Design a binder for these strands. Sequence first.
RNA 1: GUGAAGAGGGAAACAACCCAGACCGCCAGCUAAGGUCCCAAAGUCAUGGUUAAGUGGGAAACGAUGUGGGAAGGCCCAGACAGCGUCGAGUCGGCCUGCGCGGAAGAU
RNA 2: GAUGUCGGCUCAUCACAUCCUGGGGCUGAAGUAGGUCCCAAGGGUAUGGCUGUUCGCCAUUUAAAGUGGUACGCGAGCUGGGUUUAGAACGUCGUGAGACAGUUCGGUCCCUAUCUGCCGUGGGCGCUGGAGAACUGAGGGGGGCUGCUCCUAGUACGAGA
RNA 3: GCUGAAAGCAUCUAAGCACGAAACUUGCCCCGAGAUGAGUUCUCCCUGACCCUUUAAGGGUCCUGAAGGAACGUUGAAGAC
Lengths: 38, 168, 141, 207
Amino acid sequence: MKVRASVKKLCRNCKIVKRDGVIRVICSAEPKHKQRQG
Amino acid sequence: SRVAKAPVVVPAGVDVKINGQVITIKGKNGELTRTLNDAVEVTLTFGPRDGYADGWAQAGTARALLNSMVIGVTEGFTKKLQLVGVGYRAAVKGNVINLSLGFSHPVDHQLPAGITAECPTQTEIVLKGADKQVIGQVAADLRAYRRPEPYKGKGVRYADEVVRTKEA
Amino acid sequence: KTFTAKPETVKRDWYVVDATGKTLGRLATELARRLRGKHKAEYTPHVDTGDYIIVLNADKVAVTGNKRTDKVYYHHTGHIGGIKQATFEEMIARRPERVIEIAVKGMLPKGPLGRAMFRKLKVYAGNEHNHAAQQPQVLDI
Amino acid sequence: IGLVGKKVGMTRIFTEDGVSIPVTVIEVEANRVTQVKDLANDGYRAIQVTTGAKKANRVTKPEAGHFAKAGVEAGRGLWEFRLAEGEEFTVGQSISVELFADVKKVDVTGTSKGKGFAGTVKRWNFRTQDATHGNSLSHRVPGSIGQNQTPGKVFKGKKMAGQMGNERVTVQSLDVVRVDAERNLLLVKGAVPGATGSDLIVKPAVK
RNA sequence: GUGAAGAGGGAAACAACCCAGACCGCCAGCUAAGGUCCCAAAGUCAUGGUUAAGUGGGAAACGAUGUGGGAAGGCCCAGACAGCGUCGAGUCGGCCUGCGCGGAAGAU
RNA sequence: GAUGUCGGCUCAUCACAUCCUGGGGCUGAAGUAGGUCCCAAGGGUAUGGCUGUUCGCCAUUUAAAGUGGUACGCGAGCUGGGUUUAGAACGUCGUGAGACAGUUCGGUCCCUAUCUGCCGUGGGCGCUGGAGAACUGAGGGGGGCUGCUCCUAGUACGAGA
RNA sequence: GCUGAAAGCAUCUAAGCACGAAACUUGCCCCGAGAUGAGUUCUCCCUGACCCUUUAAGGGUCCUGAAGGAACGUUGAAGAC
Ligand SMILES: [K+]
Ligand SMILES: [K+]
Ligand SMILES: [K+]
Ligand SMILES: [K+]
Ligand SMILES: [K+]
Ligand SMILES: [K+]
Ligand SMILES: [K+]
Ligand SMILES: [K+]
Ligand SMILES: [K+]
Ligand SMILES: [K+]
Ligand SMILES: [Mg+2]
Ligand SMILES: [Mg+2]
Ligand SMILES: [Mg+2]
Ligand SMILES: [Mg+2]
Ligand SMILES: [Mg+2]
Ligand SMILES: [Mg+2]
Ligand SMILES: [Mg+2]
Ligand SMILES: [Mg+2]
Ligand SMILES: [Mg+2]
Ligand SMILES: [Mg+2]
Ligand SMILES: [Mg+2]
Ligand SMILES: [Mg+2]
Ligand SMILES: [Mg+2]
Ligand SMILES: [Mg+2]
Ligand SMILES: [Mg+2]
Ligand SMILES: [Mg+2]
Ligand SMILES: [Mg+2]
Ligand SMILES: [Mg+2]
Ligand SMILES: [Mg+2]
Ligand SMILES: [Mg+2]
Ligand SMILES: [Mg+2]
Ligand SMILES: [Mg+2]
Ligand SMILES: [Mg+2]
Ligand SMILES: [Mg+2]
Ligand SMILES: [Mg+2]
Ligand SMILES: [Mg+2]
Ligand SMILES: [Mg+2]
Ligand SMILES: [Mg+2]
Ligand SMILES: [Mg+2]
Ligand SMILES: [Mg+2]
Ligand SMILES: [Mg+2]
Ligand SMILES: [Mg+2]
Ligand SMILES: [Mg+2]
Ligand SMILES: [Zn+2]
């Protein structure tokens, strides 16, 4: 998990999702691309 | 919206019972009950009630759930799990799945009401039940004991899933 | 000279209120008003002219938004580091009458007379009270 | 439930394999049930028991009437034990140390010996300051008791000199070495609170 | 300009900010700033919107299918947008703007 | 018309930007062991040599030897080594008296606690006739650390190690 | 994580459901009804006469003196008192 103020899609398989008031990036391809805004 | 518009075709030998919000679909496999969100206006047809801004979103979920209930009490759902690993084994004894997953202790998973398990081989588990949510949860719980390892793919996997391995 | 109520000739009546589904703070203001006697023409700041109020179903009082989980009640024990807290839902589980009592206490005057006014509030968790002898009239808040 | 006993004193039990077990000898005479509390009348389930004997001149009329209702002779005091949901007892029933026949461990409660007014060294294990190197009148004194203007007070619970002992203490999970029903004795391994002759409450170990 | 050398009302408390300049008395009335659910005097006022964060009631670069409004585009029943080996109307992503969200750690 | 100033000792108390122990995501994570980020403040968190030292270096421990706030916490609690009185000397500056953000040897630390607070312990009255007991438990406090060995198993993992 | 739309897909979340730590609430130990919101249970004790008067939870008089308490004494593994 990358915890950052700037979260963004890093590849085509990244998806932005908001869960419980938190912007997250989930990626089907690459576990390194998983991000949480914080 | 798009999902909510599409009507759920009720088959023969299924008696739907709209008790206002509490809908109870009794079929051949069994019975399933679901209370709905207040925005929904439950052939079967679903749509928004007045004074709810998320009515179509709530209508679409309610449609999807009752579609699954109809599939549930007619044909039912199956979920297969595979064991990968030297000495990894499963065996059902009534409604408890005993698993050997390379631990120092036994792993005995008690199945809930509705679900039944059969082991066709010692490294395969086959779950069966009406409720799609419950069979999903049991399969997730069994998988959680030993999640697929990223190096050799070892552990409890779903039969469908691809385990993306890597090498050191 | 302007009229003053006299403590020994004040008329105090008994009422019973059902808290079920009522918004906590909007219930509490009406209780506070009536415990103080602000609803009476004989209202006198230094005299308790208010009424006795039984509150039933304190455990079914309602709150809006995310307050059921997020409203926090703090207290300090007087011992260093002794800051304690409970959420609204925890308070309802443990001690439901305290939710209404705390809300009303904060809306009553501070000092001896405000404490005397609070003694006229009788809060119950469930639907039954022991004060049939006082013959409480139903009050729709 | 538990039983009320008396601390007789300490001794040892030599085992065959050459272990010396330090034991407290607890005299557990028949505990006589004086009252049964129930949910309807009392709001909780418990037995009240008495044990021993009391001089009739020292038994007050209110005390005597309470024993007379139970139909038991006056003992030296009254103690309650809470009942679990299975347990059931009658007024006037005797309960002997045989209760502990199959109990492996017990908790023993008593009143600790009284040390009177104790200093911080004894009471709280405070360290002494220098005996020499210039120390002026401050050998066993407590030192600082707070900070400065912030917070400008001493905090509650500050460890200071004061009364030590003469209070209720429970020692948990003591091995039952012997239950001697004939002699009304329970032998437990190790020390328990209080002086010789003091009352002890013995219960099956909670842990 | 005010305080100093200026009281009164407001800004919780708060010389210097806002309103306003106390000759004395009144258990009359109207207003100012500021207010009107309870503490605490007065709208649980009316009508139309926005916010779901207790935002309101601290904090930036920057980040984001939060949500409201506006003007204009591209594609599209010669079948669009994922399915496009498919069936049956919307679909895409810029721009501007209202209100919110993260960014957000401190000592009794 | 005085708010005692460095360090130590004694006794602490809070924050969390976490040193250990607990939970977790990513890893250029095979395992073992790490790295990095997130959650987490319950408890725990060296002794010595040298120096007035705080610190630091060093020796040897430890699961770890946390970082800060508290008048750089704490002298009406102790010390008085440092430092800034008066004595004396060196280097240095000055014709000199003397002087030094140089050094060196010596060199008085008062207070019987009224109030707040805190630790204990009584007396009074109350609680609605009086009295002796046993209680319920609102509420408050205490406690909460962790090593090593063995088994599981030389098993999983690994070309071995 | 499950199920799941908004957004035909996908999505742990919007509705609904599950797991998750020495932190939190309990469980363990001690205090604790001045908890003036002063609680509960058990037992014990007292079952006279009379007068006046702003007549009211009024004030005396004689008789009575319980349960129990305190005091005093001998004291304690209790204690500065
Ligand atoms: K002026
Ligand atoms: K707020
Ligand atoms: K500290
Ligand atoms: K890690
Ligand atoms: K901690
Ligand atoms: K000092
Ligand atoms: K001082
Ligand atoms: K001193
Ligand atoms: K004072
Ligand atoms: K009481
Ligand atoms: Mg969550
Ligand atoms: Mg006030
Ligand atoms: Mg003693
Ligand atoms: Mg020492
Ligand atoms: Mg001296
Ligand atoms: Mg001395
Ligand atoms: Mg203060
Ligand atoms: Mg001047
Ligand atoms: Mg002024
Ligand atoms: Mg003013
Ligand atoms: Mg003011
Ligand atoms: Mg007017
Ligand atoms: Mg105005
Ligand atoms: Mg008002
Ligand atoms: Mg209105
Ligand atoms: Mg705010
Ligand atoms: Mg912002
Ligand atoms: Mg002075
Ligand atoms: Mg943190
Ligand atoms: Mg702590
Ligand atoms: Mg804490
Ligand atoms: Mg805990
Ligand atoms: Mg050192
Ligand atoms: Mg200091
Ligand atoms: Mg410090
Ligand atoms: Mg001081
Ligand atoms: Mg010195
Ligand atoms: Mg000199
Ligand atoms: Mg001194
Ligand atoms: Mg506690
Ligand atoms: Mg504590
Ligand atoms: Mg879906
Ligand atoms: Mg531990
Ligand atoms: Zn990606």
